[PDB]
Amino acid sequence: PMQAIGSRVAAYWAREMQKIVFAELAGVFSNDDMKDNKLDISGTADGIYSAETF
Amino acid sequence: AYTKISDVIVPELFNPYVINTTTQLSAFFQSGIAATDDELNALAKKAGGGSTLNMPYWNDLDGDSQVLNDTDDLVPQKINAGQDKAVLILRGNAWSSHDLAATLSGSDPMQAIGSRVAAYWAREMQKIVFAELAGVFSNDDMKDNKLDISGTADGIYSAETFVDASYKLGDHESLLTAIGMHSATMASAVKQDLIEFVKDSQSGIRFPTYMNKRVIVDDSMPVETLEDGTKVFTSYLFGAGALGYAEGQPEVPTETARNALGSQDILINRKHFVLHPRGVKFTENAMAGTTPTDEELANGANWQRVYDPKKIRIVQFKHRLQA
């Protein structure tokens, strides 16, 4: 199981990168006044995420 | 330094690769012409500040030249109106960054940096031609026969007004290939209509298709604002097959030079090319220069056509979006 243990470590670290990057954005980009010019909040009675708001 | 066929500067073995790579990678193509004939590679050779060149029409047009019965000989012969004067333009720049970008690409960019510049001039050609047509064709009363609108309170651009605008050339058909588009429009379309995604040219992947016309996505479109929510869009329809262009050539295509009191070096290109619809004639008025004119001044006003009506070949229609 050379290729086996290799697989395992591989998928492990993949998962690492995934989580760390996503949370990395999460707790930062939005909590600020700084980026606020980059965020569309909207919601508020309509918009479905289709074809337009995109 | 490094290998750097630019910083060891072999002007040979480089420049032709650059221009060819520009032609292939760019699109359009087609749509418009690719590798125009000898004629224009000749008039593209020794020339100077124009005006431009001629640039014949196509059809010899005869079929008069009447009964040869007894006594005329024949009348040798008729030709119609003429000229079709246009512009010859000149462009160029350096490269923005240092050798930073240049070999930051890598070690031996025999093909890399070339690909770079190629794609660059691709985008260039795109912008210049697009803004050019937009600046001229629409605004005058002379072209009016090629524009449709409707575009007040009812129409969605689907399946019908496309038919009308498509057949506004009543004689000629199956001459539509390219279609110019604004993003929002094709949004409405991919919502309602069947516009599908087809790997079509071979090889390579891929790009959208409405009907077997190739479509061309573009960012820049004139967009108005009328009262009451309305927004009117342009999205030219031509796909004539074609426009035309010829190369010419400056001298010193690429020059490697550096500086001293700072740490940099600079690459430069400065190519000439000749492109325009035929099509309307370019007059000389209200323009500084020269040459070329400008972007803006190459648009704002003052062009004049002679055919008139057919074999232009372009059309536009301003349609209400999907509401």
Side-chain angles (χ1 to χ4, degrees):
Chain A
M2 304 178 190
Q3 296 82 359
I5 57 172
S7 68
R8 302 295 288 278
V9 58
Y12 176 83
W13 289 102
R15 298 181 65 250
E16 296 300 324
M17 292 180 181
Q18 184 66 58
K19 186 178 176 182
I20 188 65
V21 59
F22 179 85
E24 181 175 2
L25 272 67
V28 174
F29 173 83
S30 294
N31 59 340
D32 276 335
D33 289 346
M34 301 178 74
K35 300 307 289 190
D36 61 352
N37 291 341
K38 271 65 189 179
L39 60 85
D40 290 345
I41 181 164
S42 67
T44 59
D46 61 352
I48 65 177
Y49 177 77
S50 74
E52 291 86 2
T53 58
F54 179 83
Chain B
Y2 303 93
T3 60
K4 291 175 175 179
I5 65 170
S6 290
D7 289 345
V8 77
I9 185 168
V10 290
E12 295 176 349
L13 181 62
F14 182 83
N15 298 337
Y17 170 81
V18 176
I19 294 172
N20 289 282
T21 303
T22 299
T23 296
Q24 294 177 334
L25 178 61
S26 175
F28 289 158
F29 298 90
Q30 71 284 359
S31 181
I33 192 63
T36 306
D37 63 353
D38 294 341
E39 178 67 15
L40 278 71
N41 287 337
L43 290 55
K45 295 181 183 299
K46 294 178 178 178
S51 300
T52 176
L53 286 54
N54 52 344
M55 198 70 71
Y57 300 124
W58 177 255
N59 298 131
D60 290 337
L61 268 304
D62 44 338
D64 295 347
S65 301
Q66 302 76 0
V67 179
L68 63 80
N69 185 29
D70 283 344
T71 55
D72 186 63
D73 288 345
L74 279 84
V75 167
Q77 291 194 322
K78 54 180 295 178
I79 194 64
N80 192 30
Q83 194 167 357
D84 76 15
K85 188 180 291 179
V87 180
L88 186 146
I89 67 169
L90 314 178
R91 294 290 194 182
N93 74 341
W95 276 114
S96 64
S97 176
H98 321 294
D99 198 3
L100 186 151
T103 190
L104 185 66
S105 65
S107 298
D108 179 66
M110 288 179 181
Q111 295 77 3
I113 54 175
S115 62
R116 304 290 297 279
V117 51
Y120 166 70
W121 288 108
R123 298 179 65 252
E124 295 303 315
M125 294 176 180
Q126 180 62 58
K127 183 177 179 180
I128 181 63
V129 62
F130 195 87
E132 184 172 2
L133 273 67
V136 173
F137 161 74
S138 297
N139 50 348
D140 274 344
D141 292 347
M142 295 180 71
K143 300 300 288 187
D144 65 351
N145 295 338
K146 306 304 174 294
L147 61 82
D148 290 344
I149 180 167
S150 63
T152 59
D154 55 350
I156 60 176
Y157 165 67
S158 71
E160 281 85 1
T161 58
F162 183 84
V163 172
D164 283 343
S166 297
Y167 281 80
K168 191 62 178 294
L169 305 178
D171 175 65
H172 298 287
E173 186 184 356
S174 65
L175 272 64
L176 299 179
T177 297
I179 293 172
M181 186 74 74
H182 183 278
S183 62
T185 61
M186 78 169 287
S188 298
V190 175
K191 178 182 176 181
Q192 288 178 335
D193 188 76
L194 60 84
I195 287 94
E196 191 175 0
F197 303 160
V198 177
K199 175 190 63 61
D200 183 65
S201 178
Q202 294 84 2
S203 179
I205 292 165
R206 67 171 64 198
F207 56 88
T209 300
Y210 167 80
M211 189 179 289
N212 288 337
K213 282 78 176 185
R214 294 170 63 184
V215 65
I216 297 303
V217 177
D218 178 65
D219 176 68
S220 65
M221 290 294 184
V223 54
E224 299 176 354
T225 298
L226 296 174
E227 70 285 5
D228 295 343
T230 60
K231 294 178 178 178
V232 179
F233 298 157
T234 60
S235 179
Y236 297 147
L237 169 63
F238 55 96
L243 303 178
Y245 81 82
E247 52 178 350
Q249 63 177 17
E251 71 281 5
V252 182
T254 297
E255 182 179 4
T256 300
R258 69 176 298 173
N259 191 337
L261 294 176
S263 297
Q264 291 89 358
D265 61 351
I266 50 97
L267 292 178
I268 55 99
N269 283 334
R270 67 169 67 198
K271 69 179 67 178
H272 310 304
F273 59 88
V274 178
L275 185 145
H276 66 83
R278 55 171 178 81
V280 52
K281 175 185 76 180
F282 181 85
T283 60
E284 301 302 319
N285 278 328
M287 65 169 284
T290 198
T291 64
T293 168
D294 274 335
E295 287 76 356
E296 177 185 2
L297 183 60
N299 289 339
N302 182 37
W303 292 18
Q304 183 178 356
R305 56 161 177 79
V306 56
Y307 285 98
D308 165 63
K310 272 68 178 179
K311 53 183 174 292
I312 294 174
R313 295 183 290 274
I314 61 173
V315 295
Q316 70 182 17
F317 65 94
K318 293 179 178 179
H319 61 282
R320 185 61 57 82
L321 188 62
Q322 176 60 63

